[PDB]
Structure formats: C-alpha cells, structure tokens
C-alpha cells in the first residue's frame, strides 16, 4: 500500500486535549519521503533541503503548542509528495519542479498516482483539522487557526529582508492586530510577504478558517532565524508575546 | 454534508461475494443531497440522464446476482461530484452538463470543492481500492467492470451503437468481448459513444491499470433497459458475452 507499518500515519496530532483556543497547523512539518517513492529521483542534498520541508517550522510549532497550550496538527510526510497547502487542481500540489530542480518522481503523474496521494496525504490531513474544529465548536470553544511556515532567505537571486510574514486571506482581523502590535519590533515584520493569497498560499485558511468565521493567520519565518533549538525558543517566545497580546486586544 | 436519512455516499452490495468480477456504477443515482436543493435546475433536468444513468444500477444489480459479484455504487448524483472524473477536470463539479447550466455549481470556493471531494469522490474510490487490495491479498482474481447507460439521441440523430465496449490502453477483455459479439442481435461497438479521450475511463485508470487487472466499461443505450424484462435481457446478454470472453482469455 501507500505506507509501510513502521512509517506510521500521514497526520500527527500533539496536545490533542489542549485547553488553549489556538489550533496550530503545520503542513510542511516533515521532509520524510514514503519508502515507496525512494528518492523521487532527487539528490541527497535536495532531499535534505527546503525543497522537502519548512526547516524549523515544526520545531517552532511544538514550542508554541507548549506556550499556548494549543493542539498541533501536522503532516508527517514531505510536501514534495503532496503539498497539503494546495488543492489537487493546483500544479503546485504535486510539483514537477522545486526551483531549479526537476523532480522525476513527479513527472506527469497518472490518474491512479494523483488519486493515491490525494487520498493518503491530503484528505486525511484536512479531514482531521476539520474534525477537531467541528468538535471544538460543538463544545462552544473559541478556535483561532494558526498555520506555521518557514521560508528560504534567498529566492530567485534576491535576498529577502523580511523576517516574519503575517499572512492572511479575506479576514485580516488577527493579522491586523499582530501587524499593529509588531510596530517597533526588532524583527522586520510584514503583511503578506514573502507570499500572500495572490500566490495560492492561503489554501488551508480558505478550507478551515474562513468558512466558519474563525480568527486566523499564517505565520512565515525566515528559516535562518530558526536553525537551532535556542533560535527556535527565541522566535517562539517573540511570537507568543505578539500573538497573545494581539488576541487580547481583539477581545476588547 | 448528509442528513441522517440520506445515508452514506457509497453503496456496496454483495460485499463478501465469491465472484471474480467487481462491478462499479459511478452514475447509479440521481439523488441530490438535501443541502444542495435543486442546484438551480428544473424538475425535468433533475429526472433526466443529466443526473444519473437510467437503468445502469438496475442492470448492475442483476449482474451482481449472475456473477455472484460485489457491486460498488455511488448513492448521489454526478451533478454534485462526477465520480468518474478527477478533481482537476472541469467535469468533476460541472458548471454545465451538456446543454444545461448548473447554477448550483457556479463559482465553488475552495472549502466547497474540498467538501464534495472528501464526501463523495474519495470515499467511493477508496472503497473500490480497499476491496481490490483485499482480494489480491487473498490471492484472488479481480476483473474491474463498470456499468453505464447512455441516451439514445445525440445532435438529433439516433445513435447506432446499442452496447459500447469501452477501454483504455488495456484492451484485453474488450477485444475478447468484441470478438464474442460477432453476429450478436445487438450492435456492439468499441469505444462508442465515448472513449478514453472523453475522460470516461477514469475509474479504469484508477483501479485496473496499475495492477494489470482485466477490465472494461460497458455502455448500454438506455432505451434497451427501460423496464425489468429489458434489464434482465441485457444482463443475460452481458453475462454470457463477458463470461465466455473471460473463459477464452483464461
């Protein structure tokens, strides 16, 4: 089948029974390629690079799960197999290239293979997020959907001076609060930068936050800022301060 | 997505059958889930072939009996999700079905596309795949057979074909059935009124081809199956035609 026994399940959930209002989501948490795919025709370097995952993002998400007493739902396999922040209609869902790197494992995928990945990785991930949100709503609880991502410092010959991106779709409430709260911060913090809904990166927000009117934000962290445990802890504290204050301002 | 009374997306009959044939009927039912109302369509359209393949489930049920075969069928209309299409196809959640606009499918947002994909499409094919994987794990033969009906008129001319024998790159079963239909009282034709270029071999591509399973899609002109007797006659014809074909391929 799709997974070996030892590989476990597509979807990880930590702090399932957390009391916190924040629901943390990390689609690019893991670089793991299911055994059936081998290398996808890629080099060891590309497989250990940001092509395969958002380095630092799950680590930061875990730290935020502790600080916010917040459930964390994460994908246990690589975005190279299926980018769970993309619908199956998008060319980026199962990408034929990562930057300058061709992905033979994603060459012109046939119908059985697109279905296989969609069924095994994408639907279970989103279904679980949805199940948790429905359950919270049934208990009358506030849900704040927060996705955690990292981004590469150099993109297409340009160095990105943005350090933290505050991303949002047609609901800007949390984002606005966080961006206002970030005035004067030592980090370069910007709205929908390096990506925004224009780039197709707000899919998860479109699936889970917007249809239910839930506060939400997507957080992008430049990956050099979260490269070891100390940096991760630091950035996690910064964001706990910023988003906690933001949420308090909004409830006023 | 569904009301309690509406039941489940996937129907399975004879789940624990000893037969080698696995029957699949994607366009089995015209039922619109309550949530979608009329989809902005007229009563006449909702009761037409736009919404289902009339007769197909009836024949499939008779074939299930004759082949001692499991039947997997979709319990809601192809107008909501056409389970014989992948989500990237404009025909999966169609804004138009042949000459009819479907206002209820205009400009579906991302959440709605996921909802339909997760509720109707993925459970249907997951079930078919599970059944196939279980049979293979038991060392069993699996022959994938899909059952459709088609409307008798196209562009104001009566279609000549009576039984279409439809197939993708694996023509083995189709070839044998076409050879077997020589001198039959019905007009049996290869990939007519549709072929793989029309998107109609999706289910075969998903389930048969990866493992090299014998497979075919049967198209029946719907005037040939308008009542129980007619349904029994066609199921008998198909059972003999496919049965002999399968024997000859052994």
B→A contacts (Cβ < 8 Å), by residue, are 86-88, 109-111, 113-114, 117-118, 122, 125-126, 129, 133, 202, 205-207, 209-210
Calpha distance A74→A24 (Å, rounded): 8
Strand, helix or coil at B46?
helix
Calpha distance A222→A204 (Å, rounded): 20
The answer to whether A215 and A141 are in contact (CB under 8 A) is no
Beta strands (DSSP E) in chain B are 10-13, 21-25, 70-74, 96-97, 100-101, 143-150, 153-154, 157-158, 163-166, 188-190, 215-221
CA A83 vs. chain centroid, Å, equals 10
CA A125 vs. chain centroid, Å, equals 12
Which of A89, A126, A206 is the closest to B87 by Cβ? A89
Q: How far is the alpha carbon of B124 from chain A, nearest alpha carbon, in Å?
A: 11
Count of other CB atoms within 10 angstroms of residue B109: 12
Instruction: Find the Cα–Cα–Cα–Cα dihedral B198, B201, B203, B207, rounded to 10°.
Output: -150
Q: How many CB pairs under 8 A join A and B?
A: 52
Which residues lie closer than 8 Å to A165 by C-beta, 6 or more apart? A151, A189, A190, A191, A192, A193, A194, A195, A218, A219, A220, A221
Which residues lie closer than 8 Å to A78 by C-beta, 6 or more apart? A30, A31, A32, A33, A52, A53
Chosen for mutation from B10, B81, B83, B88 (greatest number of chain A CBs closer than 10 Å) is B88
Vertex A219 angle, CA A217 and A225, to 5°: 165
Residue of A nearest to B89 (CA): A89
**Cβ burial, residue A43 (10 Å; 0-12/13-18/19+):** exposed
First vs last C-alpha separation in chain A: 52
Count of other CB atoms within 10 angstroms of residue A39: 12
Question: Which domains are delineated in chain B?
Answer: 9-250 (3.40.630.40)
Strand, helix or coil at A218?
strand
- How far, in Å, are A145, A211, B223 from residue A182 at the CA level? 19, 27, 70
Calpha distance A27→A132 (Å, rounded): 16
Name the CA radius of gyration of chain A, rounded. 18
Q: Is the backbone of residue B109 left (phi > 0), alpha (psi -120 to 50) or beta?
A: beta
Longest dimension (CA), chain B: 52
Q: How far is the alpha carbon of A109 from chain B, nearest alpha carbon, in Å?
A: 12
Query: Residue B193: is the preceding peptide bond cis (ω within 30°)?
Result: yes
Strands B21-25 and B143-150: parallel
The answer to whether B242 and B228 are in contact (CB under 8 A) is no
Query: A206 to chain B: which residues are within 8 Å by CB?
Result: 109-111
Which of B86, B109, B129 is the closest to A111 by Cβ? B86
The answer to whether B32 and B105 are in contact (CB under 8 A) is no
Q: Do A126 and B111 make contact, defined as CB atoms within 8 angstroms?
A: no
Q: For A171, which DSSP code?
A: -
């Amino acid at each position: 089948r799709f997974f070996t026994e030892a590989e476990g399940k597509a979807v990880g959930v930590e702090n399932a029974a957390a009391k916190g209002d924040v629901l943390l989501v990390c689609e690019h948490a893991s670089a793991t390629i299911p055994q059936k795919y081998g290398t996808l025709g890629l080099s060891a370097d590309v497989l250990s690079s940001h092509a395969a995952w958002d380095p630092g993002a799950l680590a930061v998400a875990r730290l935020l799960s502790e600080k916010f007493h917040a459930t964390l739902v994460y994908q246990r396999f690589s975005r190279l197999v299926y980018d769970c922040n993309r619908p199956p209609e998008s060319p980026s869902a199962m990408p034929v290239k990562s930057e300058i790197y061709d992905i033979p494992g994603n060459f012109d995928l046939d119908e059985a293979e697109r279905f296989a990945r969609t069924s095994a990785l994408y639907v279970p991930f989103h279904d679980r997020v949805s199940e948790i949100i429905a359950e919270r709503q049934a208990a009358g609880r506030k849900v704040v959907v927060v996705t955690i991502h990292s981004f590469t410092p150099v993109y297409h010959g340009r160095f990105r001076e943005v350090e933290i991106g505050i991303l949002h779709d047609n609901d800007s409430r949390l984002a606005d609060a966080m961006l206002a709260g970030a005035e004067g911060a030592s980090l370069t913090v910007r709205r929908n930068d390096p990506y925004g809904p224009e780039d197709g990166v707000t899919h998860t927000l479109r699936l889970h936050a917007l249809p239910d009117g839930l506060l939400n934000v997507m957080i992008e962290i430049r990956n050099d800022l979260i490269a070891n445990e100390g940096e991760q802890a630091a950035i996690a504290g910064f964001l706990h301060e910023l988003m906690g204050k933001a949420l308090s301002s909004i409830e006023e």
